[PDB]
Amino acid sequence: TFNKITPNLAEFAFSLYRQLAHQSNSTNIFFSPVSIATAFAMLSLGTKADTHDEILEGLNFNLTEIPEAQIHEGFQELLRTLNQPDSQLQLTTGNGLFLSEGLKLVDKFLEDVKKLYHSEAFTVNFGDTEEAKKQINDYVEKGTQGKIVDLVKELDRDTVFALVNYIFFKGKWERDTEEEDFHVDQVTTVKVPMMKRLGMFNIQHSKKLSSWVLLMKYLGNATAIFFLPDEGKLQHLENELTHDIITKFLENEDRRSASLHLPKLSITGTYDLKSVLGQLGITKVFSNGADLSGVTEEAPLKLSKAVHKAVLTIDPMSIPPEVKFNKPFVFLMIEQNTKSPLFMGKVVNPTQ
Numbered sequence: 001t002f003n004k005i006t007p008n009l010a011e012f013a014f015s016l017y018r019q020l021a022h023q024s025n026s027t028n029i030f031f032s033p034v035s036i037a038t039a040f041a042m043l044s045l046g047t048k049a050d051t052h053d054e055i056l057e058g059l060n061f062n063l064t065e066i067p068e069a070q071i072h073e074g075f076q077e078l079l080r081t082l083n084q085p086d087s088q089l090q091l092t093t094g095n096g097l098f099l100s101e102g103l104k105l106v107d108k109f110l111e112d113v114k115k116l117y118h119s120e121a122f123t124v125n126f127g128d129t130e131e132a133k134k135q136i137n138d139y140v141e142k143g144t145q146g147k148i149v150d151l152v153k154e155l156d157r158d159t160v161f162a163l164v165n166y167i168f169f170k171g172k173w174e175r176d177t178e179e180e181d182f183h184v185d186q187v188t189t190v191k192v193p194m195m196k197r198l199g200m201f202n203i204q205h206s207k208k209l210s211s212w213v214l215l216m217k218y219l220g221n222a223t224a225i226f227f228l229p230d231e232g233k234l235q236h237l238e239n240e241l242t243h244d245i246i247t248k249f250l251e252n253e254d255r256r257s258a259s260l261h262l263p264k265l266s267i268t269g270t271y272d273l274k275s276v277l278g279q280l281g282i283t284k285v286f287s288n289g290a291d292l293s294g295v296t297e298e299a300p301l302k303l304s305k306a307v308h309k310a311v312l313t314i315d316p317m318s319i320p321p322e323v324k325f326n327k328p329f330v331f332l333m334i335e336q337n338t339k340s341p342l343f344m345g346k347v348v349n350p351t352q
């Protein structure tokens, strides 16, 4: 009842999250393990040898155990699922490959990119750095009907190849707000629109994670899992999270009475993938020794720029437990058919 690559995508999600969280603790985290991995698995089609193996190993695929055909077939099925009209009403995903004009491109790569990964490849004049950046940004804008604006802020002069990966999700629950205090830290407090409700929720307190665990369903076949840590236990929560633990919560359908304070938050994350994935061991494709002969046979080529942007916008006689999501919390968003991790992150400052 899951896609073959879902455990690998879950391991990739934890690796990417833990890297970002180890760097800074006062920063929001918001990315799509699915869209980033789809993009680099699509890119691997134009790569060979160590450049190739490094990308797939960097996405947590063990090439001695998983045949490469099962990886691409896994990604194609996941894309097939996400591109269903009901999911398309809530979720927009895209990859744009921008290659220098004057490069002789391999027809097989351009066809496989389109047929297997529903991505777009474009010819751009990197000789005009400012116009190159505008054509890339206008493609993302047109793709997200104006939601993502000026994604790329700076391009290197040597840029010959840019990768842009974006995902936009409109959050609307499957089935009258008021402002309230959000305790970012002990000396910081912001105000957020909070939905107050008493109802039967899929919520539980976990002793292993020392957190309240809330599951909620959204249109587009998506389930969000919110982890609200106990005082001083956010790091313990981040450390103890595993794919098996998350699968067991997703399996739980038991509800209880609870009074919840839920913040109506929209969230965004922007990442320099050359930097982030470099720390995960994906370096060859961004260096002069890159084997991109599947993209262009004659000329040297390296991936100069790779950017990710993720956007989420919201469209018993005993006194029941009162759970307020009014302080930093971790979350995952799963696609229901595949169990794939669509999003992963942490809200620490809702105004950041």
Ligand SMILES: CCC[C@@H](NC(=O)c1ccc2oc(=O)[nH]c2c1)[C@@H](O)c1ccccc1C
Pocket: 171, 173, 176, 177, 194, 195, 224, 226, 262, 263, 264, 265, 266, 267, 312, 314, 325, 331, 333, 347
């Ligand atoms: C902890 C929950 C965060 C979450 N909130 C909601 O879905 C949400 C709240 C209030 C609402 O009032 C409405 O009328 N509709 C609403 C929806 C949402 O902001 C979020 C945060 C981080 C990751 C994913 C999501 C969906």
